[PDB]
């Protein structure tokens, strides 16, 4: 009956709200007051939600959904039939939840110590080392040490995790966990579409890579940089070499056009975590988008707590499933990177608020990439010299300043493309059994080489598990969403710049206060997961494909500059 599928999704919706709230409830209380008290309540909440998932998922499975007339109801029920981990038998479920928890915990408490000297955590201590050291051996120490202590300690967990995550996926009708993850895009052509997009950004990436390598050669010495080879992975200013803007100082196109210390000026002006998020909120509301509610301000955690209570520090945005309570937890450092991340997280919150009246099953982004993209869009405008100046973080003109800013943007946006691409290429092949525990690491480095053109500064040996040194691997968060985000964020920016009436070069656009730009975003965000994502894309951009052409157009002046510069020096693009 049509009416009985209707009643079912109504009940699911009512009961999911309550149960999901309680779990987000408990999970929050844990994350922002790790104790074994909150940790014991979290465990009990895990079983509660698994038990509701099972109850509802079993019932949803009894609907012959072909026969379902209403498309929203068909779509909700189809999703409820996926139990996720709740599909597992009781034993396996217990052990998977515990694997996830032990992996996350291992990663987040791992420290690197000098022999009778200090122990360094990943944030801020090792992150700052990677960002600011210019000494090969000091970078290597932090780079190797992090892998020694985080990645190797993940390895004892990973095989069992893969086994249980694949098992849950097969139990929900997928072939393996990767297949389950890719199905979030509802795009049978996903893998080839992503490949084409990655191929489109190779000229820009290869030219960026070659110019950066020559600049490293100049700093680190001819004996340590091969001008036709991969770059050693510890020299890019970032623990994973996944963004390169901390070595802007070594690579500036035009040293003659100096620019302000963004970080120093924020500090210099006593920016706090709160001002950072307040500025993010202001940008959202300038677009006519929704302000975060008063509750957000009361309950969010915007900086490492100081009552000596212990917390999980990775920036994250939280929906509590009651249409009222949305939160961010981030141990905000006062710097440029973190201001972007504030925007990133605030984009998540905006989406939560835009779709909060849908059925919970439809409360997701049009695809995971759209969710990751929202904040970054706003942040592209934020990073303009024009905007940074309006916030009193830059002094201003020239072609030089322009090429300098593009370079700064490139070391964030372009460098991340291969990295964000390779992560799930690796995991997809682990999940499908192509990569086994005997070759996790070797296959990671194959992809690190093939896609990013990087090599490990020291030989890896059996027992290393470098992937486990990147948060999302032990936390089991899919990563392709970030490669998608990075492409479609420039298309969004181009479309909103167009809505806003900007003309001339795309990278000069700043959509601050554009109500036309807000309306495009709001309409798409309001859809949630109610319609195939090409419809949200078409709402924003007027067409329905993912496309690198906007990112290319944004970067085109930099492409020309890098070609001229690379050609002048005879660079050989790539790493034979
Ligand atoms: C197939 O089924 C789907 C699903 O049906 C729904 O779910 C199933 C399981 C059954 O329960 C159904 O009975 C139930 O209808 C059908 O899709 C639905 O179709 C109707 C319209 O035909 C849509 O109604 C719109 O709903 C929005 C918002 O909905 C929520 O939020 C409101 C405000 O917060 C609140 O008033 C509602 O009660 C509702 O509540 C939420 O419900 C979800 C669960 O569904 C729950 O999880 C939430 O927690 C809960 N929220 C709260 C607060 O508790 C509503 O805003 C719309 O109003 C406008 O639309 C009318 C039509 O044009 C218009 O006459 C009104 O004046 C009003 O106008 C607009 O108002 C705006 C803003 O103020 C204004 O700017 C505009 O100018 C104005 N527009 C005009 C005049 O053009 C509206 O009623 C449902 O959204 C929709 N559900 C979804 C998400 O798909 C589908 O129709 C069926 N298909 C077929 C083949 O028939
Ligand atoms: C810091 C940023 N943090 C993430 C993040 O915000 O995504 C955190 C951790 C990963 C999940 N996450 C969240 O906050 C989610 N609750 C977001 C979400 C998931 C599903 C549905 C809706 C919303 C991040 O890792 N980033 C940011 C860019 C690159 C990547 C990285 O650091 O490697
Ligand atoms: C932290 O946890 C303990 C045990 O759950 C609790 O009693 C205490 O109130 C919490 N502290 C804060 C500040 O939330
Ligand atoms: Cl690595
Ligand atoms: Cl994803
Ligand atoms: Zn995110």
The answer, yes or no, to whether the previous bond of 124 is cis (omega within 30 of 0) is yes
Q: Which atom of ligand 1 is nearest to the CA of 323?
A: 49
Distance of alpha carbon 432 from alpha carbon 410, whole angstroms: 33
Written as one string, the DSSP assignment of 378-435 is: HHHHHTSHHHHHHTTSS----HHHHHHHHHHHHHHHTTHHHHHHHHHHHHHHHHTTSS
Q: Is 117 left (phi over 0), alpha (psi -120 to 50) or beta?
A: beta
Range of the domain at 360: 2-570
Distance 518 CA to ligand 1 centre (A): 22
- Measured by CA distance, the residue closest to atom 1 of ligand 2 is 315
In a domain, 206, yes or no: yes
Ligand 3 within 6 A of 35 CB? yes
Q: Which ligand is nearest to the CA of 39?
A: 3
**Coil/strand/helix, residue 329:** strand
Cα(196) to ligand 6 centroid in Å equals 24
d(CA 571, CA 198): 22
Domain membership of residue 224 (yes or no) is yes
Distances (CA, A) of 512 to 290, 306, 397, 500: 15, 34, 20, 9
Yes or no: say if 332 and 338 are a contact pair by the CB < 8 Å rule: yes
Q: Tell me the Ramachandran region of residue 272: left when phi exceeds 0, alpha when psi lies from -120 to 50, beta otherwise.
A: beta
- On whether residue 576 sits in a domain, the answer given is no
- Other C-beta atoms lying within 10 Å of the C-beta of residue 356: 18
47 alpha carbon, distance to own chain's centre: 28
Asked if residue 352 is part of any domain, the answer here is yes
CB 344 near ligand 2, within 6 Å: yes
CA dist., res. 175 & res. 193, Å (int): 21
The answer to whether position 39 is within a domain reads yes
State the distance from the centre of ligand 3 to the C-alpha of 303, rounded, in angstroms. 18
Q: Which ligand is nearest to the CA of 449?
A: 4
Question: Residue 332 and residue 338: Cα distance in Å, rounded?
Answer: 6
**Is residue 317 classed as helix, strand or coil in its secondary structure?**
strand
User: Residue 360's Cα: distance from chain center in Å?
Assistant: 23
Which residues carry out catalysis?
Answer: 345, 472
Whether residue 370 contacts residue 524, with contact meaning beta carbons closer than 8 Å, is answered with yes
Residue with CA at minimum distance from ligand 1 atom 46: 359
Flag whether 161 is in a domain.
Answer: yes
Query: How far apart, in whole angstroms, are the C-alpha atoms of residue 33 and residue 125?
Result: 22
Domains contained in the chain, number? 1
State the CB neighbour count (10 A cutoff) for residue 71.
Answer: 10
**Does residue 575 form part of some domain?**
no
> E-strand spans in 447-535?
454-455
Resolution in A: 2.0
Residue 38 counted as domain residue: yes
């Amino acid at each position: 009956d049509e009416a009985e599928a209707s009643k079912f999704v109504e009940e699911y919706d009512r009961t999911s709200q309550v149960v999901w709230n309680e779990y987000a409830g408990a999970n929050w209380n844990y994350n922002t007051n790790i104790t074994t008290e909150t940790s014991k309540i979290l465990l009990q909440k895990n079983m509660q939600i698994a038990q509701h998932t099972l109850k509802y998922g079993t019932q949803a499975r009894k609907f012959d959904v072909n026969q379902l007339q209403n498309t929203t109801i068909k779509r909700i029920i189809k999703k409820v039939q996926d139990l996720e981990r709740a599909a597992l038998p009781a034993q396996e479920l217990e052990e998977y939840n515990k694997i996830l928890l032990d992996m996350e915990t291992t990663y987040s408490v791992a420290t690197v110590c000098h022999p009778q000297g200090s122990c360094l955590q990943l944030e801020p201590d090792l992150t700052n080392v990677m960002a600011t050291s210019r000494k090969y051996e000091d970078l290597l120490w932090a780079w190797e040490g992090w892998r020694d202590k985080a990645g190797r300690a993940i390895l004892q967990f990973y095989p069992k995790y893969v086994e249980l995550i694949n098992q849950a996926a097969r139990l929900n009708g997928y072939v393996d966990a990767g297949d389950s993850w890719r199905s979030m895009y509802e795009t049978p052509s996903l893998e080839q579409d992503l490949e084409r997009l990655f191929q489109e950004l190779q000229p820009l990436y290869l030219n960026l890579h070659a110019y950066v390598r020559r600049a490293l050669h100049r700093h680190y010495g001819a004996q340590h940089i091969n001008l036709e080879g991969p770059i050693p992975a510890h020299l890019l200013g970032n623990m994973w070499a996944q963004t390169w803007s901390n070595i802007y100082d070594l690579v500036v196109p035009f040293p003659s056009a100096p620019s302000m210390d963004t970080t120093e000026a924020m500090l210099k002006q006593g920016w706090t975590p709160r001002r950072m998020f307040k500025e993010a909120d202001d940008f959202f509301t300038s677009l006519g988008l929704l302000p975060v509610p008063p509750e957000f301000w009361q309950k969010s955690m915007l900086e490492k707590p100081t009552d000596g209570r212990e917390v999980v520090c990775h920036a994250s945005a939280w929906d509590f499933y009651n249409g009222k309570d949305f939160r961010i937890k981030q141990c905000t450092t006062v710097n440029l990177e973190d201001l972007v991340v504030a925007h990133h997280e605030m984009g998540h919150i905006q989406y939560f608020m835009q779709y909060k009246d849908l059925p919970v099953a439809l409360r997701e982004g049009a695809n995971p990439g759209f969710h990751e993209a929202i904040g970054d869009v706003l942040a592209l405008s934020v990073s303009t010299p024009k905007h940074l100046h309006s916030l009193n973080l830059l002094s201003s003109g020239s072609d030089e300043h322009d090429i300098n800013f593009l370079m700064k943007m490139a070391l964030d946006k372009i460098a991340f493309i291969p990295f964000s691409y390779l992560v799930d290429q690796w995991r997809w092949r682990v999940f499908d059994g192509s990569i086994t525990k005997e070759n996790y690491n070797q296959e990671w480095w194959s992809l690190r080489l093939k896609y990013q053109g990087l090599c490990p500064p020291v030989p890896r040996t059996q027992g290393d598990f470098d992937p486990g040194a990147k948060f999302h691997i032990p936390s089991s968060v899919p990563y392709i969403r970030y490669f998608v985000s990075f492409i479609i964020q420039f298309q969004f920016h181009e479309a909103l710049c167009q809505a806003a009436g900007h003309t001339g070069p795309l990278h000069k656009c700043d959509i601050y206060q554009s109500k036309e730009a807000g309306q495009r975003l709001a309409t798409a965000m309001k859809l949630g997961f109610s319609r195939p994502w090409p419809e949200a894309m078409q709402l924003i951009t007027g067409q329905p494909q993912m496309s690198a052409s906007a990112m290319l157009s944004y970067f085109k002046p930099l492409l020309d500059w890098l070609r001229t510069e690379n050609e002048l020096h005879g660079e050989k693009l790539g790493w034979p």
